[PDB]
Design a protein around this ligand. Structure first.
Ligand code: HEC
Ligand code: HEC
Ligand code: HEM
Ligand SMILES: [Ca+2]
Ligand SMILES: [Ca+2]
Ligand SMILES: [Cl-]
Length: 417
């Protein structure tokens, strides 16, 4: 049944536009439309990478939620292949039968791997899931991580803790365009929320850190941020604190180290989740948790492809997408921060790609985009319609999507109670 889906993808010529492609032979091309056809071949690949899906299918593994979300969408609205190629020898039209089957195969992929038991039956096939209400953690290590998160001694100055860039009462963020580090260093990119970071595939806009623990070793030693020379410098200061040291040795009787401080902080960060958004309560069957407008907004959100990228538990955070997918973005000049994932991979296709932001709590993490230059949700939604979807929408529909986004404010239970 995996093989049935693979047979279909091969049959219909999807791989011609959604894999890395040689210049095709001349008899594939429509006279008068060679350029549009080359542009379509490239945009296909930029938009959707079928080699990822083929690879997962053949190891019998889960297809990513973004890839299911994309495929569902194209099947739902009957977009693929583009209708102008379907009378060609190499590209097939897709029948109602076949569409219904793919849509069914997605639904059982989502049921096997992604849907949660506690969401209402009617909503188990959504491209999105509620935040789990609890993650298992080690309570003693959480208490350490909580103290270290808020300890300015990890910075050269002893003035900056993690909280300076990620205040837990202000959405996990500093509310600045980009963050201000030691010596007043102005940083290169907008600081994302620590809320629900645990659900990201990888951490940092470029995805250069694999886990929360690896991420936590970054800012302490980054000259642009906390700017400590070494863990030795930091520990020489933490060592003079009995209360903290005594508690620390209780866990990790090895003593202070980068490994162990980053581990403590990471464990704390697994408690920085925000379940019971009005949206999540609605996914769990409470029909009155959303307004009429927010339900419409949610429908619009799916209709305009937002859930293709912003899917899963945190409505994003799961994949790397180019800023300017469907239309070149007005960078003015492209900086190293705009280059994004390519800094990590060195791959041309990753140029300008950026971890899709989870939209959980987005109403609380202004300003927006990685540049920190988009001050409102109205703006961010419009800019995403133009550049990521290739579309305009009337005001009233934008207002509705924005209302829906306000529904994603979860509930953080403060550590101390
Ligand atoms: C202190 C120990 C912490 C912890 C636990 C975190 N931060 Fe920050 N942070 C800052 C900026 C600008 C970014 C994005 C940087 C980039 O992409 O290059 C981050 C990123 C993170 C993440 C990743 C989250 C994600 O969704 O990708 C996490 C989990 C995180 N931080 C936690 C800015 C700052 C600071 C500015 C001066 C300081 C200080 C810190 N961070 C410190 C910490
Ligand atoms: C409906 C059409 C969509 C809405 C509504 C939003 N998106 Fe996206 N999105 C994508 C990326 C790669 C980013 C980060 C961009 C950057 O580098 O500046 C975003 C960002 C947003 C944001 C801002 C969130 C924040 O700053 O933390 C919002 C509010 C947002 N998106 C809403 C990627 C994609 C994507 C990929 C192809 C699509 C189809 C969409 N986004 C669609 C929507
Ligand atoms: C059944 C075969 C195919 C499947 C399953 C498929 C799937 C997809 C998917 C998942 C997307 C991403 C969703 C999106 O960005 O809108 C997409 C977009 C795209 N595909 Fe394909 N595709 C197929 C065939 C083709 C072919 C043969 C071409 C080119 C001749 C092509 C060109 C594109 C283009 C240009 C886009 C960007 C769409 C846009 O902006 O409207 N696709 N396709
Ligand atoms: Ca055909
Ligand atoms: Ca922001
Ligand atoms: Cl995923």
């Amino acid at each position: 049944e995996n093989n049935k889906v693979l047979g279909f993808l091969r049959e219909k010529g999807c791989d011609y536009c959604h894999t890395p492609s040689a210049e095709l032979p001349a008899y594939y091309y429509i006279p008068g439309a060679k350029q549009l056809m080359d542009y379509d071949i490239k945009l296909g690949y930029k938009s959707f990478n079928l080699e990822a899906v083929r690879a997962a299918l053949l190891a019998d593994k889960p297809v990513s939620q973004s890839d299911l979300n994309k495929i569902e969408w194209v099947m739902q609205y009957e977009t693929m292949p583009p209708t102008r190629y379907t009378a060609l020898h190499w590209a097939g039209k897709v029948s109602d039968e076949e569409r219904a089957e793919i849509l069914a195969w997605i639904a059982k992929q989502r049921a096997e791997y992604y849907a949660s038991n506690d969401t209402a039956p009617e909503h188990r096939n959504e491209p999105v899931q509620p935040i789990p209400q609890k993650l298992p953690t080690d309570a003693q290590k959480v208490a350490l991580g909580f103290a270290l998160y808020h300890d300015p001694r990890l910075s050269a100055d002893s003035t900056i803790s993690c909280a300076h860039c990620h205040a837990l009462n202000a959405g996990g963020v500093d509310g600045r365009k980009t963050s201000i580090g030691v010596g007043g260093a102005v940083g290169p990119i907008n600081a994302p929320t620590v809320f629900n970071s645990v659900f990201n595939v990888e951490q940092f806009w470029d995805g250069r850190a694999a886990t929360l623990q690896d991420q936590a070793g970054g800012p302490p030693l980054n000259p642009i941020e906390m700017a400590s020379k070494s863990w030795d410098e930091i520990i020489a200061k933490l060592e003079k604190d009995p209360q903290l040291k005594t508690q620390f040795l209780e866990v990790y009787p090895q003593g202070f180290s980068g490994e162990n401080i980053t581990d403590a902080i990471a464990e704390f960060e697994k408690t920085l989740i925000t379940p019971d958004s009005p949206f999540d309560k609605w996914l769990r069957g409470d029909e009155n948790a959303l307004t009429a407008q927010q339900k419409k907004g949610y429908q619009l959100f799916k209709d305009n492809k937002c859930a293709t990228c912003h899917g899963g538990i945190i409505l994003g955070g799961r994949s790397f997408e180019p800023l300017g997918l469907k239309k070149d973005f007005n960078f003015g000049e492209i900086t190293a921060a705009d280059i994004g994932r390519m800094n990590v991979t060195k791959e041309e296709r990753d140029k300008l790609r950026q971890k899709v932001p989870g939209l959980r709590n987005v109403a609380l993490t202004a300003p927006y985009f990685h540049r920190g230059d988009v001050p409102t949700l109205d703006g961010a939604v419009k800019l995403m319609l133009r550049y990521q979807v290739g579309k305009e929408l009337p005001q009233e529909d934008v207002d509705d999507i924005v209302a829906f986004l306000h529904s994603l404010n979860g509930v953080y239970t403060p550590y101390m109670q």
